[PDB]
Amino acid sequence: SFEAIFGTYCNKIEWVTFLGTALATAAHAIMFHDLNKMTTGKMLFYIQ
Amino acid sequence: EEMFNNFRLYYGDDPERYNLSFEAIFGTYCNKIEWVTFLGTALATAAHAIMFHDLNKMTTGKMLFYIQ
Structure with a gap:
């Protein structure tokens, strides 16, 4: 019996x-897609 | 039927809100x-x-044997 x-x-x-x-x-x-592949990410601000 | 009820109720009729298992x-x-x-x-x-039905009337344990 079971x-x-x-x-x-x-x-x-x-x-x-x-x-x-x-x-x-x-x-x-x-959503980026190669963030494992990326070294760095920078923004450039040109400002007068 | 008993086996399918082991799968139906004894796993849980809803797979959500719980899951019965063993x-x-x-x-x-x-x-x-x-x-x-x-x-x-x-x-x-x-x-x-x-075997008898009842033993009330013929109670006395005399048993004769008419032996030839």
Whole structure:
């Protein structure tokens, strides 16, 4: 005769995302694609 | 049906809000006691079985034998 012993997994969490938070109004989240390949990224500001 | 209900209810009818599962298997054993008949034993050829309905009227344990 054979019937095993059970245990309950849970799968209820909160599915928060960057764009559903209010920090995506602090920065616009640019998906680059070779950021592992990149050395540096600079902005140039020409200012009079 | 019992097996599909093990998959349906004993996993969880909703795969969300929980997931029922098992970890440890469980195999045990519950033997059935061997039916032994008195009247089907080798003991029964020592006996002459006679069964009554009730024993109230013919109570006195005299038994005559008219022996030729």
